[PDB]
């Protein structure tokens, strides 16, 4: 009622492996937005309840804008937010990011900033990547999709790292920073073996063709996680613009 009453859908953003995220736009205001709908069993979820109680709180223009969450009669829950205009980092990743070196770089430092904000708060994404990386129209991250099932208080598999901790969002940022500094990976072969190689126990390995990344990425990929950055403490570290 309140979603069909006060909303029309304009396309299907993405379908997510509990329920889809529908661009729309709002009657009154006339503004788009996402809109993750989930289908709920009351009394199981709980987490759920709790992750959205805990992600309302943040705010960062690094993180997806939160509007709204309301639940309609046995079914459905409902999550308004921000449609960022310029899709994900995935598609800017796929599109030739590994060219614009000035460009590359400042996106890196926002993901950052938000990790940053995020770790602060005493929480954790875990579920980080391209895909869960959105752009507005501006051009500026809005980190986004932390999952809702999923504890985000810090007490797919290529971004999993191999181990609660701060550090696993950093490891994932290595394989996605490595993938916004490369040039967009045809084939899913391509995609899957090169970042295997960057995942190797003693030290990872990395394609024949940059120097800067290089340096960075090794750091953030480090396997024992205590020699893994903090975001600010990266943020710090001279290998760094603008
Ligand atoms: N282009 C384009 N594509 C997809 C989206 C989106 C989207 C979206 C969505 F529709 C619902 C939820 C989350 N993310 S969430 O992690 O579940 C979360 C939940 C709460 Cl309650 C609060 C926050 C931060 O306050 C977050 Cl991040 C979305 F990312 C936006 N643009």
Same mark, same amino acid.
């Given at each position: ?15 997510? !492996?509990?329920?889809? &995220? ?12 996402? &809109? ?21 709180? %943040? $705010? ?5 804008? #939160? ?7 046995? $079914? ?12 994900? +980092?995935?598609?800017?990743?796929? /599109?030739?990011? #590994? ?7 400042? %996106? *890196? ?5 938000? =990790? !940053? #904000?995020? $770790? ?14 959105? =752009? ?24 999993? @790292?191999?181990? #609660?901790? /701060? ?13 916004? @500094? ?14 295997? /190689? ?7 390995? *990395? ?13 953030? =990929? ?11 403490? =990266?943020?710090? @570290?001279?290998? +760094?613009?603008?």
């Amino acid at each position: 009622s309140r979603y069909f009453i006060e909303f029309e859908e304009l396309q299907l953003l993405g379908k997510g !492996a509990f329920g889809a &995220v529908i661009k729309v736009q709002n009657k009154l205001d006339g503004c788009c937005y996402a &809109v993750k709908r989930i289908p709920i069993n009351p009394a199981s979820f709980r987490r759920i309840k709790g992750e959205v109680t805990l992600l309302s709180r %943040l $705010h960062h223009e690094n993180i997806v804008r #939160y509007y709204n969450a309301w639940i309609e009669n046995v $079914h459905y829950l409902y999550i308004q937010m921000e449609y960022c205009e310029a899709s994900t +980092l995935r598609d800017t990743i796929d /599109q030739g990011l #590994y060219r614009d070196t000035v460009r590359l770089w400042r %996106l *890196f430092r926002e993901i950052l900033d938000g =990790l !940053a #904000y995020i $770790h602060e708060k005493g929480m954790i994404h875990r579920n980080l990547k391209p895909v869960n990386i959105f =752009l507005d129209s501006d051009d500026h991250v809005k980190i986004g999709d932390f999952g809702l099932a999923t504890d985000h208080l810090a007490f797919e598999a290529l971004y999993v @790292s191999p181990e #609660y901790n /701060q550090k696993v969002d950093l490891f994932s940022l290595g394989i996605i920073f490595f993938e916004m @500094s490369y040039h967009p990976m045809v084939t899913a072969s391509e995609r899957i073996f090169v970042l295997n /190689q960057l995942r190797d126990p003693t030290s990872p390995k *990395f394609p024949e063709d940059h120097a800067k990344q290089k340096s960075v990425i090794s750091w953030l =990929l480090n396997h024992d996680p205590a020699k893994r950055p903090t975001a600010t403490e =990266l943020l710090k @570290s001279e290998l +760094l613009p603008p």
